[PDB]
Structure 1
Amino acid sequence: MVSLPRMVYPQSKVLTPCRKDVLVVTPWLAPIVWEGTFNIDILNEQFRLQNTTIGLTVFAIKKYVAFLKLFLETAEKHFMVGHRVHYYVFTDQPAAVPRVTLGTGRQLSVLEVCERRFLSEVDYLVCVDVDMEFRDHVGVEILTPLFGTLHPGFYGSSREAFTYERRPQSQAYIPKDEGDFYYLGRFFGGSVQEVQRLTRACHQAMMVDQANGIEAVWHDESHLNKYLLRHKPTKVLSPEYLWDQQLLGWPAVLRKLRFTAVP
């Protein structure tokens, strides 16, 4: 709505690709977020003017509560810094949640293990796994109605090699000649509405597979991929946003490693 203020930055070169080594836009015109493709100053202005609030959801059950401290501490240094953030930690051990110091405008809720609550408190929802840590900037450049993240182990793979559910009996089934990318189940999100639609669809699909006595090869991730195949994401995040340096190193194609597995 509101107009952006005067800003000074490099023009942008119509005749110069921002990247010559990677695909920066999908066939359905959704941007693929790589370092160098965005001016964070412009994006920060756009989202702050909207007083955007981002919700970050994580599940920490059983032995996984041990990952919370590093997860939250690093998020405080790299996730949506400058914007309103609301952390939602779902755990079976509320008292085991570390007391992490948060910056201003950021809050955390412990939910022991509602839907409409999200719609009321945040504009976007970012759903990630807790056994990770932020190592670099993860900001508003990822926000959009719906986004998936390229899985680090298959970004350069052909569709036939993707570990999609290949059994026709499963609702998550995807044949060999179908598929755009293999998205990681550990990092996805979008507007509250779109995220609830995705989780709702996947919940029902999994219920169907259950009754039929079948369980997708990679569970939630398998259904996520089926959903995103049929409902194209409005933005796709590159592997910079979901990596594992111990297992994959640090390729030249990745100018930054932002969110990674904890060794």
Structure 2
Amino acid sequence: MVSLPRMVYPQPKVLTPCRKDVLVVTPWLAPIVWEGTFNIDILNEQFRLQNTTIGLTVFAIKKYVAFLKLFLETAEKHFMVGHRVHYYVFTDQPAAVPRVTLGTGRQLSVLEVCERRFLSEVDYLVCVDVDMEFRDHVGVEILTPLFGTLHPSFYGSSREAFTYERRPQSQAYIPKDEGDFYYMGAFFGGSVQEVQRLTRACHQAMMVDQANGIEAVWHDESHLNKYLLRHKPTKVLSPEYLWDQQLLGWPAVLRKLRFTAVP
């Protein structure tokens, strides 16, 4: 909206790609976010000028409350640092939420287990699993109306290998000749409006499956994939954003490991 200030940085080279080893844009022209494809200083300026507020939602029920301390502590070091952040922790154990020290402009709300609240408190919603930890920068480069993240086990696989729901009787059904990528349900987001549209669509699809006595092979994630196939995400995050170094190591194609599973 408002003009950017004078900035000094390397000139982009039209005849020189940032990454030649990976696909950096989808066939529907959505950027695929990899290290080396973005100048974070320009993006930080753009989003700060809009006073962007990012909501980060996590569910922590039963034994999963034990993962909150590390999750939040590392989020404080790597997630949207410099921007307004509102954590939303949905849990069945409010008193079990650890007291983590937050940086300025960041807040945390504990919700024991309306959506209109999100529309009035944040601009973007980022939905992730709690048994994870941030190990490197996860910032505004991910913000867009709707984004999904490439599952680390299938980013180099053929669509036939994708573990989509293959039974026509399920609303999440995707035939062998269809599919762009296999997105992991552990990290997705977008504007509040788009995220709520996705969740409402997923919820209705799962209810229909329940009525027909069928459960998608990978539950919510199967429906997430059906939704993103029919409603293309405006940005796709590379596996840098969802990794497990113990199970997958550290491939050369991954310059940074940003958000990983906890052993």
TM-score, normalised on structure 2?
A: 1.00
Q: Deviations over 1:64-83 (max 9, x none)?
A: 00000000000000000000
SS state of the match for residue 21, structure 1? Answer: coil
* CA–CA separation in structure 2 for the residues paired with 1:212 and 1:101: 47
Aligned length in residues: 263
1:77-106, Cα deviation, whole Å (9 max, x unpaired): 000000000000000000000000000000
Aligned-pair distance for 1:14?
A: 0.1
How many angstroms does 1:111 deviate by? 0.3
Structure 1, gaps ≥5 residues long: none
- Secondary structure at the counterpart of residue 86 of structure 1: strand
Correspondence for 2:233: 233
Looking at structure 2, the residues matched to 175 and 98 of structure 1 have their Cα atoms a distance apart, in angstroms, of 44
Instruction: Tell me how far apart the structure 2 counterparts of residues 134 and 94 of structure 1 sit (CA, whole Å).
Output: 23
Matches within 5 A, 1:109-120: 109-120=109-120
Q: Distance in 2 between matches of 1:94 and 1:215?
A: 31
Q: Note the C-alpha offset of 1:114.
A: 1.1
In the TM superposition, residue 13 of structure 1 has moved relative to its aligned partner by: 0.3
Q: CA deviation at 1:257?
A: 0.1
Equivalences for residues 87-126 of structure 1 within 5 A: 87-126=87-126
Residue 187 of structure 1 aligns with which residue?
187
Q: Per-residue CA shift, 1:138-178, capped at 9, x if unaligned?
A: 00000000000000000000000000000000000000000
Runs of 4+ in 1 over 3 A off after TM superposition: none
CA distance in 2, matches of 1:87, 1:14: 39
Q: Secondary structure at the match of 1:133?
A: strand
Gaps of 5+ in 2: none
Deviation of residue 127 (structure 1)? 0.1
Deviation at 1:230, TM superposition (A): 0.1
Query: 1: distance between equivalents of 2:112 and 2:98?
Result: 14
Task: Give SS of 2:59's match.
Answer: strand
Q: In the aligned structure 1, how far is the partner of 2:149 from the partner of 2:101?
A: 29
TM-score where L is the length of structure 1: 1.00
- Root-mean-square deviation (Å): 0.3
Tell me, what secondary structure is at the counterpart of 1:195? helix
Residue 222 of structure 1 and its aligned partner are, at CA, apart by 0.2
